[PDB]
C-alpha cells in the first residue's frame, strides 16, 4: 500500500525495485529497469570484486619450531597473527563498509526512481509522499506503463490533470 | 588431525575436517591444505546483496 518511505513490499517478487499500482483497469506489483542491469549489475560487479580480490591460499600450511628457536617461532607467530589481524580487519571492514555502501546504494536507487517519477508527475501530481504519487486525473493501465518506463509525457496528461488549478 | 578418513572429496581441508572452498574466507582453522580460502577470526562475514528486509 505504501512505499520505501515506510518499508518494502511482500507482494512484489519480480523486483529489488519496482512499482505498486492501483488504477481503474488493474492492481499489482512489478519490477523495472532500475533493478534489471542496474542495481543487479552494480551488485554483481561488487560481489565478484570481493570474491576476485582474495588470493587462494596456496601458501605454507604451517611450520614446526625447535626448543631453541623460540624467537623464530615467535616471529612466525607474529607474522601469522599480524596477517590474521590485518586480514580479519580488512575482511570485516570491507564487509562493513561494503554493506553500508550497498544499503546506501539501494536506498539511493529507490530514491532515484522516486525522483524520476516526481520529475514527470509533479507537474500534475496531487500529492507526493509516503512513497506514493497521487494524480489530478484518473489513471488506467496505460498511465501506469508510461510512468514505469519514463515515457509519461506529462503535457498530454496535465491538461486534464488539473483539479487543483480548477479549484483555485 | 584425529578426524577419520572416509569416502568423500574436497578441494581444501583443515585439521577439523574437510571444507567446500567456494567462499573467500573461512573461520574453521588457521592451518589448511589444498585450494583454500583465507582464515579470519571473524565469526561472520555476510555481505549484503539485497535490500533491508523491512516490510511497509
Amino acid at each position, epitope marked *: 500500500i505504501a512505499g520505501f518511505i515506510e518499508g518494502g513490499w511482500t507482494g512484489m517478487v*519480480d*523486483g*529489488w525495485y519496482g512499482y505498486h499500482h492501483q488504477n481503474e483497469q488493474g492492481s499489482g506489483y512489478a*519490477a*523495472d*529497469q532500475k*533493478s*534489471t*542491469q542496474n542495481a*543487479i*549489475n552494480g*551488485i*554483481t560487479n561488487k*560481489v*565478484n570484486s570481493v*570474491i*576476485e580480490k582474495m588470493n*587462494t591460499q596456496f601458501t605454507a600450511v604451517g611450520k614446526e619450531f625447535n626448543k631453541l628457536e623460540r624467537r623464530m617461532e615467535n616471529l612466525n607467530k607474529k607474522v601469522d597473527d599480524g596477517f590474521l589481524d590485518i586480514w580479519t580487519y580488512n575482511a570485516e571492514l570491507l564487509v562493513l563498509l561494503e554493506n553500508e555502501r550497498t544499503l546506501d546504494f539501494h536506498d539511493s536507487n529507490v530514491k532515484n526512481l522516486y525522483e524520476k517519477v516526481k520529475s514527470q508527475l509533479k507537474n500534475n501530481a496531487k500529492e507526493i509522499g509516503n512513497g506514493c504519487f497521487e494524480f489530478y486525473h484518473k489513471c488506467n493501465n496505460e498511465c501506469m506503463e508510461s510512468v514505469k*518506463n519514463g515515457t509519461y509525457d506529462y503535457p498530454k496528461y496535465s491538461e486534464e490533470s488539473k483539479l487543483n488549478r480548477e479549484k483555485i | 588431525s584425529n578426524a577419520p578418513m572416509d569416502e568423500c*572429496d*574436497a*578441494k581444501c581441508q583443515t585439521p577439523q575436517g574437510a571444507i*567446500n*572452498s*567456494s567462499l573467500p574466507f573461512q573461520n574453521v582453522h588457521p592451518v589448511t591444505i589444498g585450494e583454500c580460502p583465507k582464515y579470519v577470526r571473524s565469526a561472520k562475514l555476510r555481505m549484503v*546483496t*539485497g535490500l533491508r528486509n523491512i516490510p511497509s
Partner: antibody
Amino acid sequence: QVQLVQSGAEVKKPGSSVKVSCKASGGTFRTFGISWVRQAPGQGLEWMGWIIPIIGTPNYAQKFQGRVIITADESSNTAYMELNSLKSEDTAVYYCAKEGRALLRYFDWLPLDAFDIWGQGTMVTVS
Amino acid sequence: DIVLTQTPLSLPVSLGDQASISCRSSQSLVHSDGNTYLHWYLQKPGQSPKLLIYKVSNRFSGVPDRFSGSGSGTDFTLKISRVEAEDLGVYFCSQSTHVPPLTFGAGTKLELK
C-alpha cells in the same frame, strides 16, 4: 572459465536415466552461469536449463520441467543433470555452456547474455 | 515460443565471394535494457557451436574481422565480407531476452561452390 569439459555414456535403456556433467576450469565457478543445451542428430540446438551455482535454484526448460533434474556442486566446480524416465528419444550430444556477464540471478527475466565458452563431449547413446 | 527462424539457402559460395544469411522472429529481440540480445554461432561437424557474433553489430574475440552483422526488431542478418576456407558449416541465431532462450532453429547451411 575458459574451458568446460564433459563426458558421455553407454547405452541407456528406456525407463532408466542419463547422467551428464561438466567441470569448469579456472576460478569463480560459483557465479558462472552454466546452461545445458542438447542436439539430436540432424537437428538444431535446444535448452535444457540454467544455473548460477551458489546464488540460486535452477530454471528448467519447459519441455523438461517434469523430466529433468539440473543441479550443481560449487565445491567440485561441476554442473550436473539427470534425465529421468528415459523414453530413448533421439539423444546424441549434450553441451555445457558458460554465459558472458553471468549476472547474479534474482530475476529470471534478466538477459541470459552470450555463450563465450561452449564445451564438447557428452556423447550419449540410448536404446 | 522464442522463435527466430533461419532462411534455408541453396547457396554454395566460392572463396572470395561475399555472403550473408538472415533470420525472422515472431517477437522483438529488443530487451527493456535497450539492448538487442542477438548472437550468432557457427557449428562444424564434430564441433561445439562456437560464438562468432556477441551483439547484433559486434563480432566476438574468437572470430576474424570478416564477420559482422546488423538488424532490428525481428529482422536480423549475419554478414561475411569475404568467404574463406575457414567458413563452412551451419549458422544459428540466438535470443537471450527470455528465460527459455531462442530455439537455435534449423540453422543455415553454408556450402562451398
